[PDB]
Automatic annotation (TrEMBL):
<feature type="domain" description="Protein kinase">
    <location>
        <begin position="14"/>
        <end position="262"/>
    </location>
</feature>
<feature type="binding site">
    <location>
        <position position="46"/>
    </location>
    <ligand>
        <name>ATP</name>
    </ligand>
</feature>
<feature type="active site" description="Proton acceptor">
    <location>
        <position position="139"/>
    </location>
</feature>
<feature type="binding site">
    <location>
        <begin position="20"/>
        <end position="28"/>
    </location>
    <ligand>
        <name>ATP</name>
    </ligand>
</feature>
<comment type="function">
    <text>Receptor tyrosine kinase which binds promiscuously membrane-bound ephrin family ligands residing on adjacent cells, leading to contact-dependent bidirectional signaling into neighboring cells. The signaling pathway downstream of the receptor is referred to as forward signaling while the signaling pathway downstream of the ephrin ligand is referred to as reverse signaling. Highly promiscuous for ephrin-A ligands it binds preferentially EFNA5. Upon activation by EFNA5 regulates cell-cell adhesion, cytoskeletal organization and cell migration.</text>
</comment>
<protein>
    <recommendedName>
        <fullName>Ephrin type-A receptor 3</fullName>
    </recommendedName>
</protein>
Amino acid sequence: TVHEFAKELDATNISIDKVVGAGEFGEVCSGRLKLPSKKEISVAIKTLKVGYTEKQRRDFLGEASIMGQFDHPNIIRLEGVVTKSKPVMIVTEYMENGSLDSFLRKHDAQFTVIQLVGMLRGIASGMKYLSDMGYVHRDLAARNILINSNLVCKVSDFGLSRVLKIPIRWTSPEAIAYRKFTSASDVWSYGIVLWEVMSYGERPYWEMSNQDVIKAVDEGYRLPPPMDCPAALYQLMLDCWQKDRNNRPKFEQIVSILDKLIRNPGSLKIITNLLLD
Ligand SMILES: Nc1ncnc2c1ncn2[C@@H]1O[C@H](COP(=O)(O)OP(=O)(O)NP(=O)(O)O)[C@@H](O)[C@H]1O
Ligand SMILES: [Mg+2]
C-alpha cells in the first residue's frame, strides 16, 4: 500500500496553479502545498483521470509507493498523496526547468562543461542511492530526469522500476537479449544519459531501426563522441558501455570520477555514424 511510504495530504493544503504536462494517468500541474509547519512550497501535482480503471489506480499509486521509499537530494521528493478524496493526487517537489532532455535541447552549446558535469554528478548520486536500496530503474534516460531552477538534476519516473517499456536505446545488450536487468544495466543506461547530456539532448542512435541499434551495439559499435566532448567523459561513456557488465564501473565509482573532474576542471580541457569500440 501507498500509505506505508506516502503521507496522506489534506487537500485544503493544496492549491493548483496551471497545467504543465500530461501523463499516462491524467494531467500534471504546478501549484503550492502548505506544510504542517505553515511553510508553503511549490509542488507538482499529478491527478488520476476521472473514470479511472482499478489497474490505472494501482499503477498510478504504485509509482508513488516506490518513490516514497527514497529520500535523497537527487531523487524526486514525494510530498504525499491524496486518496481519501477524488481526484486522487500525487504531489512531488516542483522542478522549474522540467525534463532534462527537452531543457538541454533549448540550450544547445549554452552551458559550461562544469555545469554539465554538475548535472551528471547529481544523476549519478541519485542512482548510487537507488542501487544501494536494491532497485533497478530500467528506464534511466534524460527524459526521466527533472531539473530545477538551480540546475539540480533528480531521478524521476519509477513506472518501470523493480526491486532486485523496454526502452531499447537506453537498455544494455544483456537486458535486451534476455531481460538480464541489474544495477550494471542501469550503469549502461547512465552511459547513454551521459551521451545525451553532452550532446544537448540529441536522441541516442538517432532514428536507427531498432533491430540495427540492437545488432550494432552487439557487434561492438558505440555512439560517437559528442562535439567538443572531453576525453575523460567519452572514456566514461565507453566504460559504462562495456560488453561485460562486470567490467562496468559501479555508481559509487562514477560519482567519484565526476567529483575528481569537478575538483580538477583543467582535466576537462583535453578533448576527444557509430564507432567500433
Ligand atoms: N516535479 C515536476 N516539476 C515540474 N514539472 C514536472 C514535474 N513532473 C512532471 N513535470 C512536467 O510534466 C511533464 C510530463 O510529466 P512526466 O513526469 O514526464 O510524465 P509522463 O507520463 O512521462 N509524460 P511525457 O513525458 O510527456 O510522456 C514533464 O515533461 C514536465 O515538463
Ligand atoms: Mg516523460
